[PDB]
Amino acid sequence: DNQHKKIKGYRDLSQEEIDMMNRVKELGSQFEKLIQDVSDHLRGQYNASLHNRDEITRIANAEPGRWLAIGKTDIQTGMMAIIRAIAQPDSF
Amino acid sequence: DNQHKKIKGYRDLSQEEIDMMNRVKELGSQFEKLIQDVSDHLRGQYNASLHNRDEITRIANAEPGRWLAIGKTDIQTGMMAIIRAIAQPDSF
Amino acid sequence: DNQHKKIKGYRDLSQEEIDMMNRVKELGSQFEKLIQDVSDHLRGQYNASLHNRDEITRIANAEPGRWLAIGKTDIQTGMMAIIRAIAQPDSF
Amino acid sequence: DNQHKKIKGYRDLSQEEIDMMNRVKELGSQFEKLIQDVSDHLRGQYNASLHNRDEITRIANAEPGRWLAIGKTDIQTGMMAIIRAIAQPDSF
Amino acid sequence: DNQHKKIKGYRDLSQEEIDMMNRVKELGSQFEKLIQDVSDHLRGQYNASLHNRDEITRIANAEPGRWLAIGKTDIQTGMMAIIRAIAQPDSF
Amino acid sequence: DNQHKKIKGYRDLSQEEIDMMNRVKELGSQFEKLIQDVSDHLRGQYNASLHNRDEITRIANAEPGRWLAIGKTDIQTGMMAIIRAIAQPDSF
Numbered sequence: 001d002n003q004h005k006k007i008k009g010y011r012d013l014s015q016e017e018i019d020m021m022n023r024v025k026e027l028g029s030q031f032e033k034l035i036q037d038v039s040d041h042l043r044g045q046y047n048a049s050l051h052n053r054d055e056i057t058r059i060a061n062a063e064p065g066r067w068l069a070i071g072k073t074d075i076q077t078g079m080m081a082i083i084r085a086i087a088q089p090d091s092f
Numbered sequence: 093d094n095q096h097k098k099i100k101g102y103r104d105l106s107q108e109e110i111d112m113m114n115r116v117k118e119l120g121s122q123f124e125k126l127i128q129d130v131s132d133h134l135r136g137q138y139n140a141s142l143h144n145r146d147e148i149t150r151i152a153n154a155e156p157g158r159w160l161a162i163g164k165t166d167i168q169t170g171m172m173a174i175i176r177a178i179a180q181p182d183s184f
Numbered sequence: 185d186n187q188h189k190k191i192k193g194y195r196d197l198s199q200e201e202i203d204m205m206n207r208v209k210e211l212g213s214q215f216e217k218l219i220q221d222v223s224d225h226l227r228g229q230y231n232a233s234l235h236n237r238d239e240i241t242r243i244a245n246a247e248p249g250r251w252l253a254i255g256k257t258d259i260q261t262g263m264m265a266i267i268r269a270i271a272q273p274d275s276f
Numbered sequence: 277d278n279q280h281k282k283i284k285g286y287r288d289l290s291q292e293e294i295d296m297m298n299r300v301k302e303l304g305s306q307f308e309k310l311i312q313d314v315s316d317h318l319r320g321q322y323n324a325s326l327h328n329r330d331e332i333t334r335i336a337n338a339e340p341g342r343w344l345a346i347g348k349t350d351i352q353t354g355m356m357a358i359i360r361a362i363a364q365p366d367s368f
Numbered sequence: 369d370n371q372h373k374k375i376k377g378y379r380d381l382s383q384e385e386i387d388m389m390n391r392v393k394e395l396g397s398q399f400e401k402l403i404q405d406v407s408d409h410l411r412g413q414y415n416a417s418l419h420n421r422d423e424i425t426r427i428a429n430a431e432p433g434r435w436l437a438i439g440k441t442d443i444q445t446g447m448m449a450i451i452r453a454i455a456q457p458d459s460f
Numbered sequence: 461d462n463q464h465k466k467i468k469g470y471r472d473l474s475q476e477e478i479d480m481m482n483r484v485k486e487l488g489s490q491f492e493k494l495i496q497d498v499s500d501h502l503r504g505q506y507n508a509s510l511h512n513r514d515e516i517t518r519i520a521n522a523e524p525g526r527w528l529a530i531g532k533t534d535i536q537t538g539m540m541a542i543i544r545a546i547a548q549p550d551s552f
C-alpha cells in the first residue's frame with residue numbers, strides 16, 4: 001500500500017502532475033503503434049524483395065530494423081525524461 | 093531542382109514512404125505541443141514558488157528544465173532514427 | 185493516496201523490487217558525491233591556473249565541465265534504465 | 277614502455293588525477309555487481325514464471341533485459357565522461 | 369519528382385548547403401572504413417586466441433564488438449545531427 | 461612514469477593497437493575542422509540575416525548551434541567507444 005512512499009526520492013504528486021504524466025504515456029502509445037506499422041512495412045518490403053539479391057543487399061546495408069530499434073529507445077527515454085521533468089524526484 | 097538527387101546516399105522515395113515519414117513528423121508536432129505545455133507548467137510552478145526558499149531549492153535541485161531539454165532531444169533523435177528506418181539512405 | 189495506481193502502466197511492486205530500486209538510487213548518491221568532488225577539483229584547478237594563459241587555454245579546450253555534465257546525465261539515465269528493468273512498467 | 281606518451285592527446289597525469297580516475301572505476305565495480313544482481317533477479321523471475329503464459333508475456337513486453345543492457349551502457353559511458361573530465365585529453 | 373517538397377519541414381537547399389552535407393557524409397565513409405578495419409582486427413585477434421581460454425575470456429569480458437557497434441551508432445547519429453545543423457528542417 | 465600501469469583496468473598495448481587508436485583520433489581531427497567550418501557557416505548565415513526578422517526567427521526555431529553541439533558530442537563519444545573496442549580495458 002502506497003508504495004511510492006517507500007521509494008527514495010519520490011514525492012507526493014498532484015492530480016495535475018499525474019494527468020500530465022499520463023498524457024506523455026498516451027502519446028507514446030501512438031508512437032508504439034507507428035513503430036509497429038513501420039516494422040510491418042519493413043517485413044513486407046523484405047518479403048517482396050526475396051530473390052532480388054540487389055534489393056535484399058540494399059535493405060541489409062541500410063539496417064532499417066536496427067534504426068527502428070534505435071528510434072524506439074530514444075522515444076522511450078525521451079518520454080522518461082519528460083515525465084521526470086514533471087514528477088521531479090528528490091534524488092540524484 | 094530535385095535537390096535530393098545531389099545529396100549522397102539519398103534514394104528516390106515512394107509516396108507510401110513519404111506518407112510514413114510525414115506521419116512521424118506529425119506525431120512529433122504533438123510532442124512539441126506537450127513539451128511546450130510542460131514548459132509552461134514549469135514556469136508557473138516556479139512563479140508560484142517565489143519567496144518559498146525551500147520549494148525554489150527543491151525545484152532547482154530537481155533540474156526539471158534540464159530534464160525537459162533532455163527528453164526533447166531524445167524525442168527528436170528518435171524521430172530521426174524512425175524516419176531513417178523508413179527512408180533508408182544508401183550511405184554510412 | 186496510492187498515487188501509483190493512477191499512473192498508467194505502473195504495477196504493484198514487491199518489497200524485494202522496492203529494495204533493489206532503492207539500492208540503485210543509493211549507489212547513485214555516491215556518484216553524486218564523486219561528481220561534486222570532481223567539480224570541486226575543477227574549480228580549484230581553474231583557480232590555481234589564473235594568469236597562466238596557456239594552462240587556462242588548455243583547460244578551456246578540454247571542456248571538462250561539459251564532460252562532467254555529460255557523464256552525470258549518463259549516470260542518471262543509466263540509473264533510470266536499471267530501475268525500469270526492475271520495476272517493469274506495463275506501458276511503451 | 278610509457279605507452280601513454282605515444283597516444284595522441286594524452287598528457288602526463290598527477291597522482292591526484294590517477295586517484296580520482298580510479299575512484300570512478302571502483303564505484304563502477306559496485307554498479308557491475310548491482311547489475312549482475314539484477315540480471316540474476318530477472319532469470320529467477322522468468323524461471324518462476326514458466327508456464328504462466330500471462331506473466332511470461334508481461335515480462336517479455338516489459339523487455340527488462342534490454343533495459344538492463346541500456347542502463348549498463350549509460351553507466352559505463354557516464355564513467356568514461358567523468359574520467360575524461362578528470363584526465364582531460366588534448367585532442368578533439 | 370522533387371520529393372523533398374512533399375516532406376514536411378524540408379526547405380530548399382543551396383548548393384553550398386548540399387556541399388557541406390556531402391562533406392559530412394564523405395568523412396563518414398572514412399569512418400566506415402576505419403570501423404571495418406577495426407572489426408577485421410577483432411576477428412583476427414579472436415582467431416589468434418582460439419584455445420587460449422584466458423585470452424578468449426579477457427576478450428569476451430571486454431566486449432569489443434559491442435563497443436565497436438556503440439561507437440558506430442554514435443558516429444552515424446553525430447553525422448545526422450551535423451547535417452541537421454546545416455540543412456535546418458522547419459519541423460520539430 | 462608509466463602512468464597507465466597505475467590506472468585500473470588498463471593493459472599494456474601493442475604498437476599496432478596504439479596505431480589504430482591514433483588513427484581514430486586523427487579522423488576526429490578532420491571532424492573537428494568540419495565542425496568549425498559549419499560553425500563559421502552558421503555565424504555568417506546569422507550575420508547575413510540580421511534585420512530579416514523572418515529569417516532570424518527561422519534560424520532560431522531550427523536551433524542549428526544546438527544540433528551542431530549534439531553532433532559534436534556524438535562524434536567524440538563514438539570515437540571513445542571505437543578506441544575502447546581497440547584498447548579493451550579490463551574493467552567494467
Ligand SMILES: Nc1nc2c(ncn2[C@@H]2O[C@@H]3COP(=O)(O)O[C@@H]4[C@H](O)[C@@H](COP(=O)(O)O[C@H]3[C@H]2O)O[C@H]4n2cnc3c(N)ncnc32)c(=O)[nH]1
Nearest residue numbers: 102103172175176179181372378379448451452455456457
Ligand atoms: N531542409 C531540409 N532538411 C533536410 C533535407 N534532407 C535532409 N534534411 C535534414 O537533414 C537531416 C539528416 O539527413 P541525413 O543525411 O541524415 O538523411 C536522413 C536521415 O538519415 C533520416 C532522417 O531524416 P530527418 O530526421 O528528416 O533528418 C534530416 C533533416 O533534418 O532520413 C534520411 N533521409 C532524408 N531524406 C532522404 C531521402 N530523400 N532519401 C533517403 N534517405 C533520406 C532537405 O531536403 N531539406
Ligand SMILES: Nc1nc2c(ncn2[C@@H]2O[C@@H]3COP(=O)(O)O[C@@H]4[C@H](O)[C@@H](COP(=O)(O)O[C@H]3[C@H]2O)O[C@H]4n2cnc3c(N)ncnc32)c(=O)[nH]1
Nearest residue numbers: 004010011080083084087088089194195264267268271273
Ligand atoms: N516524485 C515522484 N517521481 C516519480 C514517481 N513515479 C515516477 N517518478 C519519476 O518519473 C520518472 C519516470 O517514470 P516512468 O513513467 O518512466 O516510470 C518509471 C521508469 O520507467 C523507471 C525508472 O524510474 P525512475 O528512474 O525513478 O524515474 C521516474 C521518476 O524520476 O521505473 C518506472 N516506474 C516507476 N515507478 C514504477 C512503479 N510503481 N511501477 C512500475 N514502474 C515504475 C512518483 O511517485 N513520485
Ligand SMILES: Nc1nc2c(ncn2[C@@H]2O[C@@H]3COP(=O)(O)O[C@@H]4[C@H](O)[C@@H](COP(=O)(O)O[C@H]3[C@H]2O)O[C@H]4n2cnc3c(N)ncnc32)c(=O)[nH]1
Nearest residue numbers: 280286287356359360363364365470471540543544547549
Ligand atoms: N591525458 C590523458 N587522458 C587519458 C589517459 N588515459 C585515459 N585518458 C582519458 O580518459 C578517457 C577515459 O578513459 P577510460 O578509463 O574510460 O579508458 C579508456 C576508454 O575506455 C577507451 C577510450 O579512451 P579515450 O576515448 O581516449 O578516453 C579516455 C581519455 O580521454 O580506451 C580506454 N583506454 C585508454 N587507455 C587505455 C590503456 N592504456 N589500456 C586500455 N584501455 C585504455 C592518459 O594517460 N592521459
